[PDB]
Amino acid sequence: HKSEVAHRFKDLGEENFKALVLIAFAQYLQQCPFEDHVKLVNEVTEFAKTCVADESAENCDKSLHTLFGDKLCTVATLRETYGEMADCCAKQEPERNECFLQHKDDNPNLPRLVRPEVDVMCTAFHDNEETFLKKYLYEIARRHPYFYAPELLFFAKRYKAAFTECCQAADKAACLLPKLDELRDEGKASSAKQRLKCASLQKFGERAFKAWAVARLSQRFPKAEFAEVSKLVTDLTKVHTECCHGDLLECADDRADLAKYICENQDSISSKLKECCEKPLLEKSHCIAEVENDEMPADLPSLAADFVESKDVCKNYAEAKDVFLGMFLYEYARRHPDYSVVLLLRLAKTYETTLEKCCAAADPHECYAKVFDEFKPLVEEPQNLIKQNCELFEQLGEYKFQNALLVRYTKKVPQVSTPTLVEVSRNLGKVGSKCCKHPEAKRMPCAEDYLSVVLNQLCVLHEKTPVSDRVTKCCTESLVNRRPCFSALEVDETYVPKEFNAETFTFHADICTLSEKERQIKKQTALVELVKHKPKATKEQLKAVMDDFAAFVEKCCKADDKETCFAEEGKKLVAASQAALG
């Protein structure tokens, strides 16, 4: 059209427009103060209205990158504040934009945002709803420069709904606090995946991404033809590359096009898409990527027909290897919404290895006739891990379950730092209560989704401060062997127990006054240290001590006097325990 700005403004709306411009600026100029960005939003919004009124008004012809880049080069303190970035302004548009992206610090040194008290938040919320939500939106976006703007916006609205609903509530805190905690994990989760997918695209390459995509798309759109899914995988790939490069605009448009396409061919893709395709521009993509799995045909053949029994397997495979394998995945994935994507990838890989060995042999058909029997243990391994662990989780609670993981993993890798072992086990415990409440058919997909960010995140830490070659092995293994590699870690026999330190096992009454989350962490921290000191202790000896510790706490908190109790009894405990563990 004549004017891009006019257009976006029109089919986005002033409110969303202002919010997005704010986010965009906050993401590039992470150092400027809030009031400075607000001024810019106003100036750009005014500009936009001018173009809405006259498509032919001065500058309205300009493109968004050009417009955006100019206003950016407006900042006076630019060179004094961002040094090198200012040199970008000396370049022509294409390079200019490109130059800005390269100076977008993916993780600056800003203070960690602290959460104020419910009352202050609620009061601030009512006194000026807008600047309240905008300032935080500003704080969050400058700290997460690669977070897709429209999604950052979707979160903000949920946050607003929570304040509306809770700042009116009798027990404000009992209402809000838990809603905020949940919103945070989801936001941190969303953020981690975002970074995760792009890192993956980098390491593993396009081939691996396409495969991951085929499987994923097929589980969701089981009724679509392979031609459609191929078309989608291709476009989805252009979209991820684009979106990972960091260019918001190009990223947003590619996502827009892909959504409208899907919505138009909605009949040849899925039936669970009606709701999503009825929503406004800003939310279509988001809705679609979240859509529920559509139901499969029921009148579907057996894979063995076309992939095992049918002579020609090799002729068709040699004709177009990745395509044939893509077909295998499509076929296998859409009949199994219950498998994690990586499991599907492991089957496809096993099948590829086989076709490679068999198609170059005397009698093909007989060499690969029993390939499906190889899939069995591959499918059963993950299945049994879920079952065993979910059963254990039902017996104990999220808490006692977290302590079980603590003992278990401290033993595998004692070298690991205590605060890290506690962080990880608690998150694992969360995943436990999150996914174990689903029925078997949805358990594996669930665990995969959560376990992937947890696994990825723990690998980076170790990347920063390696402690074990074993972990490094698993962390640099193939995307398909990662989890299995970690599952295979057995007890570290080499390890030498930490020498006893009386301080580590000393407790004062300050634990009677502490809160749940605090008491637990302190108990769990002591637990890891206990195992690091006596790694050969049985699950029995250990439970014994833990039980003695159970009383100790009580027989000292609910006591006529703390301090003393924790000093007299405390000495007794260490002595007893020390003895019962050689």
Ligand X SMILES: CCCCC/C=C\C/C=C\C/C=C\C/C=C\CCCC(=O)O
Toward ligand X, which CB reaches closer, 82 or 147?
147
528 neighbors 421 (Cβ within 8 angstroms): yes
In the bound state with ligand X, the residue whose beta carbon lies nearer, of 289 and 567, is 289
Contacts of residue 513, defined as CB under 8 A and 6 or more positions apart, other chains included, come to none
**CA neighbor of 416 nearest in space, from 502, 532, 530, 518:** 532
User: What amino acid occupies position 532?
Assistant: K
Which two tokens mark 189?
């989760």
Shortest Å, Cβ 316 to ligand X: 14
User: Nearest approach, Cβ of 372 to ligand X (angstroms)?
Assistant: 16
Q: Is 50 exposed, middle or buried (0-12, 13-18, 19+ CB in 10 A)?
A: middle
120-145 burial, b at 16+ Cβ within 10 Å, e below that, comes to ebbebbeeeeeebbbbebbebbbbbb
**Closest to ligand X by CB, 29 or 363:** 29
Q: Residues comprising the binding site?
A: 1, 4, 11, 65, 238, 242, 245, 247, 250, 253, 257
Smallest gap from Cβ 292 to ligand X, in A, equals 11
> How many beta carbons lie within 10 A of that of residue 114, not counting itself?
5
Output 1 or 80, the one with its CB closest to ligand X.
1
487 residue type, one letter? S
**Which lies closer to ligand X via its Cβ, residue 97 or residue 191?**
191
Q: How many CB atoms lie within 10 A of CB 276?
A: 21
Minimum Å gap between C-beta 581 and ligand X is 5
Closest to ligand X by CB, 26 or 85: 26
Smallest gap from Cβ 43 to ligand X, in A, equals 9
> Which residue numbers belong to the known binding site for Cu cation?
1
Closest to ligand X by CB, 82 or 450:
450
Rounded to an integer, what distance in angstroms lies between the CA atom of residue 396 and that of residue 76? 60
Task: Answer for the pair 333, 303: CB distance below 8 angstroms, yes or no.
Answer: no
H/E stretch holding 199 reads helix 172-220
Name the binding residues for Ca(2+): 4, 11, 242, 247, 250, 253, 257
Give the residue with the Cβ less far from ligand X, 388 or 564: 388
CA–CA dist 236, 4 (Å, integer): 24
Q: Which is nearer to ligand X, 363 or 409 (CB)?
A: 409
Burial of 27 (0-12, 13-18, 19+ CB in 10 A): buried
Do 552 and 569 contact (CB within 8 A), yes or no?
yes
CB of 362 to ligand X, least distance (A): 25
Write down the least CB distance from residue 309 to ligand X, Å. Answer: 21
Q: How far is the CB of 85 from ligand X (least distance, A)?
A: 17
CB of 87 to ligand X, least distance (A): 21
Binding-site positions for (4Z,15Z)-bilirubin IXalpha read 238
Listed residue (113, 78, 114) closest to 99, CA to CA: 78
Residue nearest to ligand X (CB): 187
Distance CA 78, CA 514 (A): 47
CA dist 241 and 198 (Å) reads 8
